[PDB]
């Protein structure tokens, strides 16, 4: 594949969730209707909803959920979670 360094990522007990993962899960989010996606995004003035996230970068499917991001449109709000033995917030590692 191309080369490229490491890019700004969350580290969810180990695996790294790349920014770019997480904002075309924002995307989605936000270009869905509540509840339309299996059940998501869910909604948390500035609108915050939750959406899940996959560690393959491959968009959610449906079923199991081990990460999501909750975030506003623009991300200038853009948390990310793990549930993994209770929901924890993951660490932004930034490149």
Partial sequence: GPLGSMESYWDCKGIPILFR???AAVELA???QPGS?????SICPDER???PLTDTGAR??????TYYV???RDKRHCE???TAGGVYKCTLVLR
């Fill in 80 to 82: 990310v979670f793990g």
């Fill in 21 to 23: 993962t997480v904002h």
């Fill in 70 to 72: 909750e975030a506003t």
């Fill in 37 to 41: 996606i299996s059940g998501y995004p």
């Fill in 49 to 51: 909803r939750q959406f």
């Fill in 60 to 65: 959610w499917q449906g079923g199991g959920i």
């Fill in 30 to 32: 936000f270009t869905s």
